[PDB]
Design a protein around this nucleic acid. Structure first.
Lengths: 129, 140, 82, 99, 88, 151
RNA sequence: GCUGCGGUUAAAAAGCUCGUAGUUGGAUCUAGGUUUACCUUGAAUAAAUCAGAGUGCUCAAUACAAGCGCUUGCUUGAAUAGCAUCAUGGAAUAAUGAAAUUAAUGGUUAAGAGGGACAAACCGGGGGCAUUCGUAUCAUUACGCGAGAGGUGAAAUUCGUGGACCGUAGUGAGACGCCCAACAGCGAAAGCAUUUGCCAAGAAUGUCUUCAUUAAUCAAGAACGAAAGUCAGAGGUUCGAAGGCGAUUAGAUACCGCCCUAGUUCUGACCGUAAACGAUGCCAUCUCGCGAUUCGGAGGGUGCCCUGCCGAGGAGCAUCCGGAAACGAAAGUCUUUCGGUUCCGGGGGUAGUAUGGUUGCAAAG
RNA sequence: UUUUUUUUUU
């Protein structure tokens, strides 16, 4: 039974990136997936993507730029306080010079740098680098 | 795989406790019969009375007769076998002597080629065995 | 190949792809108006019909259910309704 | 150490396969595991076909044949040299040997 | 409440005659004191009168059956054989 | 078909068209189709068969698209809902048939296994319908009375 | 080992399935140009200790002091940091509720989730009950034969002129379904194979049919579960534990041969264990090429052939990555660890032993 | 056809 569309999507992206493919198809698309991909694109780790509509959950087609090392989900969505954000980033990200921790906060889905700028905690969604 | 849900704290904690008992160290330190089984009753040393002097054949490939002594502990009256270290030190130990006994070093396990001996002598007649061996002190 | 247009698949591949695994699902079935020699009444029928569809007036069997597409009675033709 | 990928049998999609009794030993061996040999021979050895023909009571008689399907357990097959051990690489070859 | 755990009807025998003998008697005692569906009126009203005699309380039919069961397996197979021969 | 108690990873299902509009050639009216559905319900057919007949003969691809409502909803509004939902009714009927078969053949261990699975499905479906208030809260599947209930 | 271990072979996947608690659960409602849960900020929150600011106790551990003028004096430090409750703001994520005189009157979609329906010269050693047939083994009858037959490495025990063994033709019993028969099929697993009839069930495929989250895994709980074994009743052909003989041997309580008892078979109950093995738990998802094979479908040619055809199986050889390696298209997508969930392991023994509990007629589980 | 053994340490 499927229980994490984001986990499936990120696994598919990772596999396609490893194989060196130029496009990847993501099944059950969702708002969370779209926001995650938007953050990745804004930081330049993927190209453009299209949301194919089929009167159902829909699909996505993402253009891979051959620049992403790993995009992983963190389950369960543990609550991250602004005080332990530093510990979580040090643990999960390869370096302090690159890589992003994606959180969902009351403001919205963003990366850990923007969350620290706005002094927001929240539940962790995943990370990419 | 282990549970990963956000509300599985009870399962994780209970499973950890259940499996800690399959750990030799944890079980040895929490079984409950430690005091009644350990001859020293959880102490480091114990005073006892020498009953006889015995010789223990060293394990293979070594060959020798280790000079041990049978002791009865005062605190509980349990019988143990203790090693008399150093050379010719069995002479200092007479029968019906009050000896201080300590562990052999491996926390209740045999040491070296001596089989089944887990204790050694530290003092005889309130005198240090090392002092007697070195000649610092003499038999009371 | 690494570079494949997942957005615009080749029409022949889309035809020779499973109905569910296409980019957007589309059934391989269709509705057909059937003409039977005789009464010459056009009758709409589902391609994969599992019921014996019967002429309203002339009471002649038009299709026979099968494992896949329904089998049309001999002498009856069909045309795909748009 | 696992010697063979098929574990010495030919059992796939199956739980249980009935056994056969070997030809020599009589041991029970699963039918997929037993070494099977279909043998078609002349009813009379090659050295006596001429004698039988020259003694034939008919102008033209077709000499019949013996058909035997033989099942061997691994032990009685190796001993009889119906099958032989192979190198590690040659073990994976599945084509029948030349006859 | 369940009065007896396992003895059931043979609880009348107390501790006598041996466990295995009482166990053997239990099956047949239950069977002979049970009520069976009549094949004529269709109601569960067949009761044993004497060994081999089964009377229906409703339709008043008397049938020759088993000693402790309304019908026996051998009689059933014989009936099946006769019916099969009749059909073919 | 899917897998509930069996190891079947089937991939055969209807693929509804992307088009949500009635075809131009489709001239049956939204009210006429409702009348046809009520007529078939009078005759005694259930929604699964009503839809099949409408698709095979009358050319109605999706009654939801044409009439704007699901067949069971139409029957409910017209006050023709059955006592038992269709799937529950069929499961109960299957259980009754398997039992009747086992009364005769008591060595059919496979039939015993199938009965166990069917009754487990019955109980789960009944729980769901009781949650949705489609069954009386005290409704319970009784082996003895199930035959009359489903007949 | 939550972060963060391992379970094919090193210890470790329950035989298999159903199932309550528990855990976990698809997508979807203002993008643009009522409740909770959670996060932020405050409030309430003894010292000593820990961290930490200041300060030449001669340094330090400490301590909480002290430093300046000039006398009648001034100024000081003894900081700051360190579940539940209340309040504030935030409205993503995750749960939860609303409707079966006017107004657009009020039902999200129909999951490459799940269930149910409908189709089929459908598919199958799937299951059950009856039934038909076949040689063979054994016994026995009739007829012929004439002295060996059987068995082994060689023999012997054994059978044989009361005429065996061998032939031909019958008769009877019980067991078993050869060849076809396969890297074939079905079943949850255990397992399943002579013909036919009946009974209920099911897979896959087809589907513009229906319901609409009904789902995954599952402590306790429950069904099934090879062989042997136990109880009762029938059968007792073959083979055959135990037993008895003949060999072999130093011995031979064995291997070999002969005669056999329980058993092997049927019916109704027990037991619940196997190297019950793929020594690999289940559900979902992604990653490679090739040509074969079983079932169904689509499109053509003449049951067969073709379609680099579509699904679903069961495999094999071109195999990224992985692995201690053997090897694995999963045992890969894991220090770049993190989809959900159940069970299990923690150096070797003692030991699956003792004791207690429970199940069983016992054996034992 | 038969074919059992090979003290301790190094």
């Amino acid at each position: 039974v499927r229980m994490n569309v984001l986990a499936d999507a990120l696994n598919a992206i990772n596999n396609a990136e490893k194989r060196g493919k130029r496009q990847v198809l993501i099944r059950p698309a969702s708002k969370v997936i779209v926001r995650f991909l938007t953050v990745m694109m804004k930081h330049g780790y993927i190209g453009e993507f299209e949301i194919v509509d089929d009167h159902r959950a829909g699909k996505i087609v993402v253009n891979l730029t051959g620049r992403l090392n790993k995009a992983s989900v963190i389950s369960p969505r543990l609550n991250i306080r602004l005080n332990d954000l530093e510990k979580y980033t040090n643990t999960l990200l390869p370096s302090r010079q690159f890589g992003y921790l994606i959180l969902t906060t009351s403001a919205g889905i963003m990366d850990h740098e923007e969350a620290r700028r706005k002094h927001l905690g929240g539940k962790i969604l995943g990370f990419f680098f | 795989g282990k549970p990963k849900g956000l509300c599985t704290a009870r399962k994780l904690k209970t499973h950890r406790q259940e499996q800690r008992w399959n750990d030799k160290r944890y079980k040895k330190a929490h079984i409950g019969t430690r005091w009644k089984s350990n001859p020293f009753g959880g102490a480091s040393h114990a005073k006892g009375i020498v009953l006889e002097k015995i010789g223990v054949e060293a394990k293979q490939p070594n060959s020798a007769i280790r000079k041990c002594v049978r002791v009865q502990l005062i605190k509980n009256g349990k019988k143990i076998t203790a090693f008399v270290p150093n050379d010719g030190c069995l002479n200092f130990v007479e029968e019906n002597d009050e000896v201080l006994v300590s562990g052999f070093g491996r926390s209740g396990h045999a040491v070296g080629d001596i089989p089944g001996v887990r204790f050694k002598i530290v003092k005889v007649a309130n005198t240090s065995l090392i002092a007697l061996f070195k000649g610092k002190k003499e038999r009371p | 190949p690494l570079a494949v247009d997942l957005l615009h698949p080749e029409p022949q591949r889309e035809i020779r792809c499973h109905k569910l695994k296409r980019l957007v699902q589309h059934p391989n079935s269709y509705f057909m108006d059937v003409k039977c020699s005789g009464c010459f009444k056009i009758s709409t029928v589902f391609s994969h019909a599992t019921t014996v569809v019967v002429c309203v007036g002339c009471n002649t069997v038009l299709c026979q259910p099968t494992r896949g597409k329904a089998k049309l009675t001999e002498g009856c033709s069909f045309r795909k309704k748009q | 150490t696992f010697k063979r990928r098929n574990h010495g049998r030919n059992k796939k999609n199956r739980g249980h396969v009935a056994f056969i009794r070997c030809t020599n030993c009589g041991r029970c061996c699963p039918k997929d595991k037993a070494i099977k040999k279909f043998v078609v021979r002349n009813i009379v050895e090659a050295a006596a076909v001429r004698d039988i023909g020259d003694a034939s009571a008919y102008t033209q008689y077709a000499l019949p044949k013996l058909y035997h399907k033989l099942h061997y357990c691994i032990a009685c097959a190796i001993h009889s040299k119906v099958v032989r051990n192979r190198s590690r690489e040659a073990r994976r070859d599945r084509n029948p040997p030349p006859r | 409440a369940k009065r007896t755990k396992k003895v059931g009807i043979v609880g009348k025998y107390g501790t006598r005659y041996g466990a295995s003998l009482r166990k053997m008697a239990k099956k047949l005692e239950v069977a002979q004191h049970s009520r069976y569906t009549c094949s004529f009126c269709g109601k569960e009203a067949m009761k044993r009168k004497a060994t081999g005699i089964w009377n229906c309380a409703k339709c008043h039919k008397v049938v020759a059956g088993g000693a402790y069961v309304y019908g026996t397996v051998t009689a059933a197979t014989v009936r099946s054989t006769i019916r099969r021969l009749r059909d073919l | 078909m899917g897998r509930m108690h069996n190891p079947g990873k089937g991939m055969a299902k209807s693929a509804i068209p992307y088009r949500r509009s009635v075809p131009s050639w489709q001239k049956m009216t939204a009210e006429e189709v409702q009348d046809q559905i009520v007529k078939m319900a009078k005759k005694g057919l259930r929604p699964s068969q009503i839809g099949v007949i409408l698709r095979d003969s009358h050319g109605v691809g999706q009654v939801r698209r044409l009439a704007g409502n699901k067949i069971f909803r139409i029957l409910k509004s017209k006050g023709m809902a059955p006592e038992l939902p269709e799937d529950l009714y069929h499961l109960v009927k299957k259980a009754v048939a398997i039992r009747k078969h086992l009364e005769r053949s008591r060595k059919d261990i496979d039939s015993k296994y199938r009965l166990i699975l069917v009754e487990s499905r019955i109980h789960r479906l009944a729980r769901y319908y009781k949650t949705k208030r489609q069954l009386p809260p005290t409704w319970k599947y009784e082996s003895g009375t199930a035959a009359s209930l489903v007949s």
